[PDB]
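Reminder to self: keep the SMILES exactly as supplied, no canonicalising. Ligand is magnesium ion.
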Amino acid sequence: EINARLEFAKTSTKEELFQKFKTSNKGLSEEQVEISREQYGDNTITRGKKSSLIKRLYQAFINPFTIILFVLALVSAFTDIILAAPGEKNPQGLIIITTMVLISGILRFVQETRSGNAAENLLKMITTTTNVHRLESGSQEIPIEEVLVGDIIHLSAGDMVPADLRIIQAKDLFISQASLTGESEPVEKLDLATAAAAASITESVNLAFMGSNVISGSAYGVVIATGDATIFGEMAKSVTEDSTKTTFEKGVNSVSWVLIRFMLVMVPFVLLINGFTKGDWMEAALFALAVAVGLTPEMLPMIVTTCLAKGAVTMSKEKTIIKNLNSIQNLGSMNILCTDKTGTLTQDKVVLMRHLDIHGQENIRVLRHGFLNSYYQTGLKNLMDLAIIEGAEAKQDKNPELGGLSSKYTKVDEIPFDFERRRMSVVVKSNTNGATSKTQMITKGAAEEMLDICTLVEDKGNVVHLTPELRAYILKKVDELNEEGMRVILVAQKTNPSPIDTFSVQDESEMVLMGYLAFLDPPKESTAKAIKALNKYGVSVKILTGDNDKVTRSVCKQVGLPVDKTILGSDIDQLDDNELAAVAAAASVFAKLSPQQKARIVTTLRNSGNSVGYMGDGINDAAAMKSSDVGISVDSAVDIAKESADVILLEKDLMVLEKGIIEGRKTYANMIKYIKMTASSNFGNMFSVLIASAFLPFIPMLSIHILLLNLIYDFSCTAIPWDNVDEEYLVVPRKWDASSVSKFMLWIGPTSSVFDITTYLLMFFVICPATFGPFSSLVPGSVAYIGFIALFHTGWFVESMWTQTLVIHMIRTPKIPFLQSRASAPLTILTFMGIIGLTIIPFTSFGHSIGLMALPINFFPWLILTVVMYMMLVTIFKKIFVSKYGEL
Ligand SMILES: [Mg+2]
Ligand SMILES: [Mg+2]
Ligand SMILES: [Mg+2]
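Structure tokens returned for the bound complex:
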């Protein structure tokens, strides 16, 4: 099996492995890559699910809305083709409905393909890359999914291990396997072929597994397993509906079910009325089909897809790259934001440096040792190390002690940073003295941890013993430096260290202390304004720092966040979850936090129902990012932070996040606005047809006219995603609602029903009789009868289109429709083009081909009066609805 091959990989020599895998020291070849792809596998994760194109399409094609449209198609085909009288066939409606069914199915399939959960990277806007060596292309960076068995991969600091790897060349490689086995302790990896039966292969020496993070050093590895064959692939499990979020799919399904409920209430009523009143069941079937067609917002999926695409493109242009379509929903409902202070609030650059001795006087030797440690560090370089390097380089012009430090020294061993010890050690050997060069250990870390391993102190050019009094004095000086906001670091040296074969954590003892290193980290000028803007939109900002509480308090004092309440890690460790929820909800500053503590805080905040998003860019932040509803990182972050994040920003600041949140809320606002408007507009007309069915001697409007009306209305409403949105709607996060649509329909549609009845009366009694003659004296079947019916249909058609388009401005905004809130240019112009085009429709021969007749001039003043009198009623009912419920 897979396991048997892993043992061979971890036990074979490098040349036998090369011969078996057909891999040379310079990479793979094209033909062998193809053979491996068609024999071993592809580095794609199925997560326990697999579906072909046919199965996926069939599954996507059976959404409720497509079933509605298919039922409409079946009814139309039965009524117009099979059960219709010979000589009269109207396949236009059937053809257009079938085409619309196909379009809706394709759009639903696209949405399903591009929608995922748990920060799934389905859009592929940004993809992580790994360094892969090949025979012809040399060293190139390729996406993780393109890695095959046998490829030689170079691992650096921060790069996530992309598959199961057997290391063939390791240079002090330390791997953080916390993302796999939960152990936050880095493990040293060697290239030796260990012939020992390690426990369960997971904690072995010369194997690097998928999903593990590289902390320090550079290593060359050979891929042995990809895809589901790795340990990470087996651990990859799909948790269906892990979050209680109501995605756009669920909202669309709820809207479709509301439409089905209304159809079941109404269509049989019309059928019964006509069948038991007029006695011709064919006319009843025609009326039922007409009502069913009218109730359907036929091009709803097209508008939904347009809204989603506009949201995605707009957020991408706003330096906010998303991972899937559910990311917009995740980000819009943000309620509490948690992040570390470094990089986000404070600019990532030191503006003031103090390399001080024990007593706080400026010293050069401490800076020299710190520069050696920083420059010869092989791991990730933070702001402090970069500031150390820049200061040392700047001071090299006048100081001969600092000259040539980057060329006469060589690293031989190193122990990377870890949150359980908070120190970094690098062993440095001189390159200009040969074997007798003598080796110097250099250790750098936080003052409290660095004071527990030092027994000597370099003071006044001489070394003295470390008494508790000196330790207390050093801690007092460190606290005093932390008072102003400077970050304090201690530096120590040791000579000689233990040999590299036995150099471990136990060797850090009896070091002599040089002094402190103070760095000033000032906050950005725009931090306060961004924080206030975020707090305006209901997003509370909490800080989860691992640094000293004094520095975080100093930063929060300038930024503006509360500083009276500060919580440390020990208190959270000693207090239970039930009190933790309250104490975290009532606080804003957290300091001295371990990564597991940050994950616990995020989980506790999420337990109270708050949608909490975590912002991070480091390896140790992966647990918090995975435990939060939304994950935010930067494009320059480590691969693990980017992979586990739901949203990736190109800039590390809060204004971009605020703009992304605004756009995410705007997308849903526009979608629900269009849905409610179209639903109410359809319901009013269909209720009118229901009421006036028993009183009218003919059909108020044909099915084809209704379908054309809906098509033109939706092509005019495709500009919804480009209209202005009220700030009061975007201030608070919003969740999907279904009964609100039903209430809106029931409370708005009957307002238009009265005026549609009025238009029925006017056309049947005033205009059409004046043009053609009284209906009671008109012999059925003649040309004049056909003209009467066509004129009535055209009149109600034009009136309905004008009403539906012009109620958009009144319904959309709960304020005054023109004096206080204004509609955007694109929606207005597109609506006007739709109105004008459809009004030209009856006059052309195409209108006469489907049963429309040219309107008389006298009709238009009545249309204007009807529009105005409808607008006043819509305003009154909008006021009543706002007073009753409070939102639209
Ligand atoms: Mg990389
Ligand atoms: Mg070692
Ligand atoms: Mg209407």
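Points to follow up:
The CA atoms of residues 802 and 876 lie 20 Å apart.
The first strand starts at residue 129 and ends at 134.
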